[PDB]
Amino acid sequence: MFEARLVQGSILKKVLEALKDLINEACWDISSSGVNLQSMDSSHVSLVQLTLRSEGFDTYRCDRNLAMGVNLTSMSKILKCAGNEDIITLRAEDNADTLALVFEAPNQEKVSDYEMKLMDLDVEQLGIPEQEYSCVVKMPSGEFARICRDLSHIGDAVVISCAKDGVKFSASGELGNGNIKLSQTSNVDKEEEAVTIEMNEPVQLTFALRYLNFFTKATPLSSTVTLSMSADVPLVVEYKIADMGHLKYYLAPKIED
Amino acid sequence: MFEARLVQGSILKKVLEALKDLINEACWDISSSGVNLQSMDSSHVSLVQLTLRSEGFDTYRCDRNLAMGVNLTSMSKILKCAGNEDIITLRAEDNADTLALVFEAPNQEKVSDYEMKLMDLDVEQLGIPEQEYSCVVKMPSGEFARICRDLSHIGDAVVISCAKDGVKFSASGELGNGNIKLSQTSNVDEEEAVTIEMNEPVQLTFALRYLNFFTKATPLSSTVTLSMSADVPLVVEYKIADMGHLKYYLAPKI
Amino acid sequence: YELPWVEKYRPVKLNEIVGNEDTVSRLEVFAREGNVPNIIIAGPPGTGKTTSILCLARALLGPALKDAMLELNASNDRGIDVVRNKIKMFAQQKVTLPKGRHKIIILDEADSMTDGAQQALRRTMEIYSKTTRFALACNASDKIIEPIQSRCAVLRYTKLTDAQILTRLMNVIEKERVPYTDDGLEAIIFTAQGDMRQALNNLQSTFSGFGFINSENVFKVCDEPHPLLVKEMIQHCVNANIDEAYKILAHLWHLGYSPEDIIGNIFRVCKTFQMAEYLKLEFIKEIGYTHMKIAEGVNSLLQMAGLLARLCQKTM
Amino acid sequence: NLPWVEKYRPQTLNDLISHQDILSTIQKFINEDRLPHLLLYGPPGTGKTSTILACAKQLYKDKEFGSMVLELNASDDIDIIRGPILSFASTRTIFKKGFKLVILDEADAMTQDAQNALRRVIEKFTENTRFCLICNYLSKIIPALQSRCTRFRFGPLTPELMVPRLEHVVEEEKVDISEDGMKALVTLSSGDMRRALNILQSTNMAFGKVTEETVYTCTGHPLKSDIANILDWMLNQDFTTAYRNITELKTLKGLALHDILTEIHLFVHRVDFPSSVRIHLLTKMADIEYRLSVGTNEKIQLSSLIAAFQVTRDLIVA
Amino acid sequence: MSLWVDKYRPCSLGRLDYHKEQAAQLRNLVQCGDFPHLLVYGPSGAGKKTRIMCILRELYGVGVEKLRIEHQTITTKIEISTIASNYHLEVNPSDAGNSDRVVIQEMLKTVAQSQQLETNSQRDFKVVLLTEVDKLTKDAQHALRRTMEKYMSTCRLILCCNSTSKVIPPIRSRCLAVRVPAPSIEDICHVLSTVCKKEGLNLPSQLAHRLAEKSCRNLRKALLMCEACRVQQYPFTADQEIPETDWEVYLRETANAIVSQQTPQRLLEVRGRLYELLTHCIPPEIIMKGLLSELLHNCDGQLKGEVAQMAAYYEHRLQLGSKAIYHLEAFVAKFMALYKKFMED
Amino acid sequence: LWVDEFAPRHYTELLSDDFTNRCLLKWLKLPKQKVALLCGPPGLGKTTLAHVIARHAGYSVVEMNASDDRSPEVFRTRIEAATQMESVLGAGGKPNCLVIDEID
Amino acid sequence: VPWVEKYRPFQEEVVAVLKKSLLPNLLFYGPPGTGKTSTILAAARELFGPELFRLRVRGIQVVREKVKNFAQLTVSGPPFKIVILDEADSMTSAAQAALRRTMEKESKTTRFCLICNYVSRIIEPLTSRCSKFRFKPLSDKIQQQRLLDIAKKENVKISDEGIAYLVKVSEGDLRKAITFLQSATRLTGGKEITEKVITDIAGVIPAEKIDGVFAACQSGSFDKLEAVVKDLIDEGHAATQLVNQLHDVVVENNLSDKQKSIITEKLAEVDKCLADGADEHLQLISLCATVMQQLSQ
């Protein structure tokens, strides 16, 4: 008899639409400690992990752990039917047969509820290890989306190089060559626009820009995005949710010639 | 080696966007006097004249005049990557195959560089005679753009009637026909002062599809200049602040 | 790690290509003179078309090869729009080259693009021919449209003779000091079927699997209906000894070979079997008809038995 | 319950049978890191896919197995080559190091242009990606494509090396099976383990007992006694009564002319006919079997088979 | 309304001149409800189109005769021409090449949708008429039967073909076969006399017999030939020089040339004649049948069986192959070899 | 190269034994046909035929091919402007000639 | 309304073993009138109860993708849903191979119960991967009584020997005699259904024509064969029907074994040629020439 009441329901819609383009279906590792999602890319190149801590909900009542798996596209589609200021509460039975989505208007009697058909998926825990990264970049989400979408016209691949002074985004393609140099923010009062770069040794990796365009869909979730990267380890893109959790992304670097 | 810099980089993006639809392959005449472009369609329906005076740019350096072919779609895709407040610096060698243009944020710790490839385009431009047009119309660019947009729906052809009291815009189609007349104003505002200089009444018809393309230069200036004669192709000119001018030529209908 | 022998010993210059000597010399002449026209390469796979084209482009463009050469493969998208957008814009792209040099567009597996793509490619080939040249490569020349061949110098390639295969293989052996025997060389040549790539790959796989190269190991790794047994098959068919031919066929079938493999190897043996020319043509026609029946679904052992019977009755 | 074909699918290298040399070679390649691209071909249901899955699971743990092995099937379709396959092969690993792995089940279904695209992709990234191509017919593979990989032929399972595997299932799934039932189960399987398991399960479901007559009825395959009777009728009885007997038997037991014709083919080669008579019979039976494929009337073909045999009687007696 | 073939074509089933029992059966079928799909078949020039037109005349009003040109396109796009009326549509889908299946599906969709638009003054369905169904491809026939099952209630199908050999059993298993035999010699004589008499003329019986036997029981041939011999010379005599089509004469001359000399140069001349024949788009089977028919007139009785078997075998090979001349040339060469062997022995 | 350099300039550069250039000029003067066609074997200089005719008559030249995406709307865009629009030049060069290449 | 669907129905035993599975893929074949679809529908209703409904299934990609959309869906919980795909033999070989692949990767959730006319459907799911079941056709006597009842209730004026002829021309299966009778009574207007009407409806060649063909063959003059074959073709009789009827006649005559063998082999060759679309007239001429050559000795 799962029950989870969320006051700020608009977050869930942004969570789903950030995944529907990359992942079609996923298993929600629902536990009394919170909601967790970890699904891997269809082409097996990338990977996404999601964590929703139980303390962030208005009321969390996961009496027993669930391994619920839904369709991300279908779940997102219903979520557009929910207003940006409507209270959203998820509910599951004593057994995970159907998903009860409850949309409650903040100040009027209009109440909407939906039920979702479920899915059976054979998934396994994937060994995401915690390591220190030789390069950590903390830059505005909008700026990262701008850079990713700009170089997408240049070419399908982007070369990311970092130094102590700043980070350089380089690309090359059929219409020409271009590179964006972003120096570390010398002095800005708030990080929301500051570009914070922490690095140990110089790094240089190439990534497909199609996925990076997919990755940028989570920009509305948080004003700032953190990029973690090191030599011979996949790029790590994490969006810090407000007192709720994080949406961490993982993408293997492309092959150098 | 050529080098130039434009503080108000938004100008380059706007002139570029408005021109890319008419022309996909244009040659740039770099000169000490400034930047000159004049490209002409294969069917010779229309001509576009672009001139950017050297003193308009913040800095300018043309060691010697050189032509270099440029793809307009590539530039439009490149220039969209530049913010409206960015400062744009252009650079090239004597006969380099690549155009080096740099987008600088307003000292906002961000430097964006690009190196566009050039074409094998070497069509040497042909001069256009100057003529004192029978009717000269100055009137707001947005109004003219709206007029072109509305009349395009009714029909593909517009009839332009020039009279001292006012100009008349007419179009006909299967769904019907409509007319728009702009009386000479009484010095309203000043961009709204629709001014008509009429030496002799003149009637001509033009394809509205091209005129719709011409209106995309609207963000450049709130005012537009219209001038025509019976045998002279219509000229539509936008004053690009003080950088130069962008002149549109279009032949009349048979 | 080490590179596959098909790449570790890929020829890097036109001087070390053992293919059709006249065409190789013509390519060298084109490289020297510079102003090479549009060339189309067709022939059996793995005879060196790709290697020849790459070596020609490298010789012509030299250091400019990085940006003066455009290469598209079946792995890339060669659609109707790509030839209209990538190829056209690359042709228009400005590149300064010496007087005898031109921008080279390489389309390997040229037979793979559709009719519309080649029709669009026609004009782009025609217009920008003053500064851009095309180097097409394909296995079947009929697949590329007639106007394209008309405005190109079609260069035929053929299956390499066993002497050229033996020379290249012995060179590789000297490079690798791999032990061998004449029977192993004959077997590797037979498995090659005039294909350098196939021969090198099979030789490398055989050496990896067993080291010393002999017919036994070669046929162990390159498992196939053994050519000798097929030779006694056909010999028995000539002597009208249907029972012995069936015995060999049943042994092969119990070994588990698919009928398609058996019939293909039978025909291959019928290539070089020493036997009357008219009777050989009769056998070839009958094997062709049986292979029709096999390829269209009827692949039972009974079909191979009927083949043996009809071959026996051809000699009466 | 769960069908026994996957309920008892091999899970480790030891579960596989009759391919110990191939498994040893692949194990040696894995241990020495020289693993090349693999081309596995053979009759259906001989454990090729299970073999490669066992090797991969040996090399890769399940935690990283999903992120380092891209299993795909060709019949699910050129966009596969340029899409997921290219994307997977164009990047290195996520967590572990070393070469990735792509398994392409039913590789023979791809078109020739798709095979060329796959060949180009394979040659481009041979250093860090290995391809396992699984197909039934080697001849369906482009000669250029098969020149990049080592070919392994998985032959049909010989009885005595596949009988013990069935015995384990019988001990597990409690079904009484006779000696002749086991022999017929082997014979109809014809080296196909999946066929053997499916026939065993269908027979158990149908009657709960496995015996030669039971399995032959369940699969519809003609019995050896029936084939001997048909051969005796054609060789001895006159045309009218032979036709009547054969038609009656066929309609009674629902026999198919293809299986009938194959079995008389085997008997013809088993019996001692004169050489010319055998040649004539083989030519005829091949012609009839060709005629069945296009979809002709079965009665006329059966009578034609009888005709082919009935002619020889005078020839054989003399 | 000028040519005798169309002028004297009966309008209704009741005024037919032969197979009147079949006309009565068809009248009973159309009179009772639940009209099924029809598979009309028979030799060309027997009256299949006439019978189907009379069936429509009984099924609907006389307005069915007011045919209209219709042009429709299909997706892939292919544009075809069709003939329809205000109760039915007629189309030969085989002319659309291998894209016949999609045009059949689209035409049936359109007819099914249009029939619901108050096209129910007399019957609750439209008639979709297909000519030369035998030329359709197997997948096209599968789509045809599937759609026929799909839209049985809203539309009905009538199929016309010269033979049922190339029609899939699934279609034949769900359509009502209507065999239309070629009329007998006497029936052709009466209809020729009836046309001759109603026109105000006089046809002697012997001339009618000569026409009937020469027409090979093809009524259209008989009517054309009768009108031609009339305009040539009205006062018909027993020895009237009845004309015949040029290609028949050319085929006969080709066979005579084959018989005359069995040499490779003559073989090449015959090949040129065969090119001339195929050029005029006469089907290869027609050429083979005519060539065999004229050849048998010259062969000895003991040789005719071998020639007939060879002709059948080579025609079958031609059906399997694609290059018609290859197999026709082979048959001609084989016949010349055998005839040379037998005449010279 | 050479072909452009020695391409015909006026009517005096035409070759003998050609019936095309000597009879196209009569139709293309201002007897009321709308469209043209090309037939016969190649090698007759049909590509330069209309160009030389326009050069002799002073008319303008427009030529296209399948190098651009040949959508029907794109066809309208490419042909309506070339047909129904005058020239931005002196009155002499205003008449135009149009050529379509690779119809299939 | 057709009378076939009106009255379409031995093998209720196979339902019990299906319910006992609490599952190899099912394959049901035999003559089409054996009630296979009704049998599987009844088995599904009994196994899953009234409250559980199921899909039934002309393209191959669409069919297989629809199979994914259904089988991909979860179930309330019985565990396995069985897919029908009747008319399996009508599917092309490539379609059947794609359907075979679709059978895999969905066996973990759904199963299949194919319905076809036996050997016409391709091998690799026919061998293994399927539990085959044969549906015996009803006995000729029972079919005769059933058609008698149908004639009585539908007041069709047909005699008992007419019923025997009708069930004869519908060799080995039902629902062909039923539709033949319906067509016959609608063509005749219900006044009387004679045996010649049934002969015309079923396409059977009258035996008198076969007797004339045999007499012409026995005559020994090729002109008579040419004339009789021309007449037979002019009657519009399909060459396949002539081959079948003459085959049935020949196989039970008093001809020599060699003669019967040669004639039947020629019949098989002619049938194969007609299957490929060869000309009917030429094939019939060749067959009759062979029959002459055998009968004139």
Ligand SMILES: Nc1ncnc2c1ncn2[C@@H]1O[C@H](COP(=O)(O)OP(=O)(O)OP(=O)(O)O)[C@@H](O)[C@H]1O
């Ligand atoms: N003449 C040759 N001499 C030596 N090695 C050769 C020769 N031809 C081919 N090879 C070897 O075969 C390899 C494959 O050749 P290449 O890629 O040029 O084939 P290709 O003939 O263009 O065929 P395809 O288009 O089918 O791939 C070469 O890298 C080289 O190792």
Ligand SMILES: Nc1ncnc2c1ncn2[C@@H]1O[C@H](COP(=O)(O)OP(=O)(O)OP(=O)(O)O)[C@@H](O)[C@H]1O
């Ligand atoms: N060598 C074997 N030992 C034990 N079981 C086997 C063996 N080969 C096949 N099987 C059984 O047959 C089933 C099917 O095997 P599998 O599909 O892996 O074979 P395959 O030869 O790769 O065939 P295909 O190409 O048809 O998939 C297995 O799940 C297993 O139950």
Ligand SMILES: Nc1ncnc2c1ncn2[C@@H]1O[C@H](COP(=O)(O)OP(=O)(O)OP(=O)(O)O)[C@@H](O)[C@H]1O
């Ligand atoms: N009458 C002529 N006078 C001068 N040069 C001519 C004449 N006719 C043809 N040529 C020359 O012959 C060549 C043919 O050029 P063009 O492209 O016009 O030929 P085309 O016959 O239209 O083309 P294609 O043969 O490809 O169909 C050119 O070099 C052209 O200058």
Ligand SMILES: Nc1ncnc2c1ncn2[C@@H]1O[C@H](COP(=O)(O)OP(=O)(O)O)[C@@H](O)[C@H]1O
């Ligand atoms: N009963 C009849 N009375 C008069 N003329 C007829 C009769 N039946 C057929 N015909 C003529 O014979 C011709 C046969 O044409 P058609 O119907 O196309 O033959 P088929 O359809 O059998 O090939 C028709 O044009 C028609 O004029």
Ligand SMILES: [Mg+2]
């Ligand atoms: Mg190559």
Ligand SMILES: [Mg+2]
């Ligand atoms: Mg397998």
